Amino acid sequence: MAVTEASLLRQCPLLLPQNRSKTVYEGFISAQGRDFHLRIVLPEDLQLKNARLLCSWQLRTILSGYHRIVQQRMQHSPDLMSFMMELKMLLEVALKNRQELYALPPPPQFYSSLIEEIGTLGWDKLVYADTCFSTIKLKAEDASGREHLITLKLKAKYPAESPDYFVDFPVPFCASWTPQSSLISIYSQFLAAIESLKAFWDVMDEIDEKTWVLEPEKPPRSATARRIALGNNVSINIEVDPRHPTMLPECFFLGADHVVKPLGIKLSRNIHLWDPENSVLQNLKDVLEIDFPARAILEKSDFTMDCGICYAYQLDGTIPDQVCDNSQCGQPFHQICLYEWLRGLLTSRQSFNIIFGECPYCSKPITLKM
Amino acid sequence: TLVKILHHLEEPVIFIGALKTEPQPDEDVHCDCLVAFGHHGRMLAIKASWDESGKLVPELREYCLPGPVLCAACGGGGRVYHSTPSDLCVVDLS
Amino acid sequence: IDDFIGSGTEQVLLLFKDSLNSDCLTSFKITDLGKINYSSENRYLVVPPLETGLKVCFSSFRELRQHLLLKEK
Numbered sequence A: 001m002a003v004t005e006a007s008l009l010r011q012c013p014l015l016l017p018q019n020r021s022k023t024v025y026e027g028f029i030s031a032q033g034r035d036f037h038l039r040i041v042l043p044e045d046l047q048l049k050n051a052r053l054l055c056s057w058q059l060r061t062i063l064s065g066y067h068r069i070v071q072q073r074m075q076h077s078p079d080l081m082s083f084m085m086e087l088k089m090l091l092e093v094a095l096k097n098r099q100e101l102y103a104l105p106p107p108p109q110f111y112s113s114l115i116e117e118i119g120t121l122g123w124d125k126l127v128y129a130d131t132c133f134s135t136i137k138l139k140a141e142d143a144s145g146r147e148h149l150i151t152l153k154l155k156a157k158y159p160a161e162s163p164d165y166f167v168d169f170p171v172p173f174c175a176s177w178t179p180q181s182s183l184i185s186i187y188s189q190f191l192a193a194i195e196s197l198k199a200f201w202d203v204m205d206e207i208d209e210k211t212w213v214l215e216p217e218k219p220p221r222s223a224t225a226r227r228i229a230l231g232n233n234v235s236i237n238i239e240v241d242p243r244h245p246t247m248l249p250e251c252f253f254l255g256a257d258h259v260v261k262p263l264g265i266k267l268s269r270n271i272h273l274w275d276p277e278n279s280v281l282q283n284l285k286d287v288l289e290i291d292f293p294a295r296a297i298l299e300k301s302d303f304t305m306d307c308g309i310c311y312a313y314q315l316d317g318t319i320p321d322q323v324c325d326n327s328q329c330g331q332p333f334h335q336i337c338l339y340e341w342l343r344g345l346l347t348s349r350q351s352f353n354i355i356f357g358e359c360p361y362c363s364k365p366i367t368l369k370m
Numbered sequence B: 001t002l003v004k005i006l007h008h009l010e011e012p013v014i015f016i017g018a019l020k021t022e023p024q025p026d027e028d029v030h031c032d033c034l035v036a037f038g039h040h041g042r043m044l045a046i047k048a049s050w051d052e053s054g055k056l057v058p059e060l061r062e063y064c065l066p067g068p069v070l071c072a073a074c075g076g077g078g079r080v081y082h083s084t085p086s087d088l089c090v091v092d093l094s
Numbered sequence C: 001i002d003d004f005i006g007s008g009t010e011q012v013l014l015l016f017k018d019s020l021n022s023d024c025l026t027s028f029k030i031t032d033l034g035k036i037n038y039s040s041e042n043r044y045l046v047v048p049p050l051e052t053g054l055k056v057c058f059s060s061f062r063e064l065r066q067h068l069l070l071k072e073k
């Protein structure tokens, strides 16, 4: 209402004037379905410039770090009405910013309904459940016979709201959630998406097995690029369209100016022989007219494909990719290390995104394109 | 020749101690946190925040752990071992 | 009845008859009546979550009873 005769009742239902002269208010204030004890003594007159405000220790614990805001509102604020308005909204904010202290689930619906749906599913799918029953992780199999996991994080009310679904595979899963839909519904959506992608998975697993995956190491299921090794100290990375995997990916070659050219030229002339009925490897073989090494490892266990500047493999994800256009050096480098070096030198001139300089080891012209 | 009131748990206090939260042998460790226990199983925890307003602010929890707590101790790396007449349980603050 | 394993929890030991041998504690049976069982995991998988569910809801129960008494007052 307009007058604080009724508006006070309407907006603080549980504040009981104790004295005849409305001077001791006591009882509860509401917040996020939670009542908190409060005795708010005023002077003989209606002044908040001077008022007492005492609490339950629960209450003070929650309004730790606003004691000043409280004092300021008491002294600046017109009436009690808006005092309680502001205080209440402030309690709302305190709690939401401490959101991590909440979520008693309703057991008569939760723990039972969840077990019933786990029964409906079957106990070969599930892989993980938290002691608080917040986090779950489930398995399904491909027709290929691959384990694909799916984490769900469920709320105090699972059926009410959508369970947040976290999944490895690359393209985004969309789940048409109704409160009528369930774990089985979303599992079926997951199976649908799975069986949709299977082709892409078949391609990725076929490359991981029959080729030397280089840049990704035990790659996860979201990864669509594949830095493959081929010949020696030349790589090709491939990023694949998840919907059209068999379709031509985005492709390129790292390595020697003299090595990389004939690959580019061969790619240009043959690309029409590419055919999306075959596998990516079976198409690469006929387009690039070569076969791949399968992890040429033990022979050359200290041959130093490493930076030759920092002398290390694996600089902060980065790999020795930039090489010398020379038969006698072939000394690989890092982008990072060769830029940092060549920047210093007198001889080094920078065009737009390129630096020409001398190879550290052999002092021959080497080009770096950032 | 003065006495100061901190919190008032509603139930009897049993154990008061201190922990090293965020532990990132030496007998004096510079203890980061403060712990109190109730009997009825109210736990209290306090820590320094120094966040949001650019001032040190006292960060209070109050957990309500199960069962009538009969005893407790603190162990290496922000761990508290406590006992209910059912089972011996633990809390990790790290 | 005692803890023969050194696990913490008490176990029951049952000795079968002296017809088997003229020897003590041959033909034994040690059991917790849970997981531990000696003699002469979709089951054991989702149980601690369920236990913790009881604990959470027991805490809420008792909390609200305290809360009720407060309102009476």
Ligand SMILES: [Zn+2]
Residues within 6 Å of the ligand: A307, A309, A310, A311, A312, A315, A333, A334, A336, A337
């Ligand atoms: Zn380097």
Ligand SMILES: [Zn+2]
Residues within 6 Å of the ligand: A324, A325, A326, A329, A330, A331, A359, A360, A361, A362, A363, A364
């Ligand atoms: Zn060189």
